[PDB]
Amino acid sequence: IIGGEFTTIENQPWFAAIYRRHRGGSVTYVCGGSLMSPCWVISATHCFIDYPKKEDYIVYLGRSRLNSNTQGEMKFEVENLILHKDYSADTLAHHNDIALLKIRSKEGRCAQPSRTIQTICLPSMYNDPQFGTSCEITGFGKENSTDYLYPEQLKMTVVKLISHRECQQPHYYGSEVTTKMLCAADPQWKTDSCQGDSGGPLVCSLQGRMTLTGIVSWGRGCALKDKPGVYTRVSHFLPWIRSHT
Numbered sequence: 001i002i003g004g005e006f007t008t009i010e011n012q013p014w015f016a017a018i019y020r021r022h023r024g025g026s027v028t029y030v031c032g033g034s035l036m037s038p039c040w041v042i043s044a045t046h047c048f049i050d051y052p053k054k055e056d057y058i059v060y061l062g063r064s065r066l067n068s069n070t071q072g073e074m075k076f077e078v079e080n081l082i083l084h085k086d087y088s089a090d091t092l093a094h095h096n097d098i099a100l101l102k103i104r105s106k107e108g109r110c111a112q113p114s115r116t117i118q119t120i121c122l123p124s125m126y127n128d129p130q131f132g133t134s135c136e137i138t139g140f141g142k143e144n145s146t147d148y149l150y151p152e153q154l155k156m157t158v159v160k161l162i163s164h165r166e167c168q169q170p171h172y173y174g175s176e177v178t179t180k181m182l183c184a185a186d187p188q189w190k191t192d193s194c195q196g197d198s199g200g201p202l203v204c205s206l207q208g209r210m211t212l213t214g215i216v217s218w219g220r221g222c223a224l225k226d227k228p229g230v231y232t233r234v235s236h237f238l239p240w241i242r243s244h245t
């Protein structure tokens with residue numbers, strides 16, 4: 001997250017920190033995720049397509065810092081990694097960038113809700129928020145494009161949804177952004193999500209209910225002028241989410 005403010009997991013109870021074990025034992029942060037139900041986390045397929053082995057992944061909930069055990073957290077492994085079978089990736093845009101991870105603790109249990117571990121509701125058929133609505137994002141991604149390290153503390157920011165016809169204009173993304181995607185950004189272009197935040201939640205207050213409207217997918221640079229962040233439109237994939245869970 002570029003700009004924005006630091007925060008703690010108690011503010012983002014459904015955020016999931018997804019790590020991966022390397023050869024030798026070293027472990028590095030990969031992508032973010034959102035808790036759908038006690039046993040399920042939804043993220044982005046491009047975060048796993050290169051190393052499709054469910055065994056190498058570690059998932060944390062109620063964890064507020066990159067390298068510190070936060071009072072109340074729960075460590076998990078992945079019982080099942082399901083990737084969207086029709087996924088692909090062009091020069092900038094990503095398609096059907098959605099994934100499901102069925103989690104399980106060493107004792108064989110799913111997540112146990114607490115003050116710092118909660119689920120977020122999915123959207124309903126054809127009912128997305130109008131353009132211009134403010135929504136928030138959270139992640140452990142770069143604070144600046146030039147950094148090579150990720151911020152030690154969790155961060156979040158607020159951006160505004162952008163209409164599809166506006167996101168398809170020449171100086172934006174043209175025909176590269178389809179109807180299955182949503183754009184969002186900062187009007188002054190000072191804050192935005194960035195590499196390291198992929199797979200994370202785009203939550204919107206819709207009709208009085210916090211709703212997982214998007215999943216961080218792609219974008220040209222970070223916080224660049226006329227270059228919004230692009231997110232997977234969850235509402236479109238409801239049938240897929242239902243059938244695979």
Ligand SMILES: CC[C@H]1CNCc2ccc(NC(=O)c3ccc4cc(C(=N)N)ccc4c3)cc21
Pocket residue numbers: 046047050192193194195196198216217218219220221222223227228229230
């Ligand atoms: C080596 C990394 C790699 C693995 N193979 C597929 C793949 C594929 C992709 C990404 N994602 C990004 O690197 C990335 C970069 C910039 C971003 C900018 C925004 C934004 N402007 N809000 C949103 C998401 C981003 C993701 C990473 C990787």
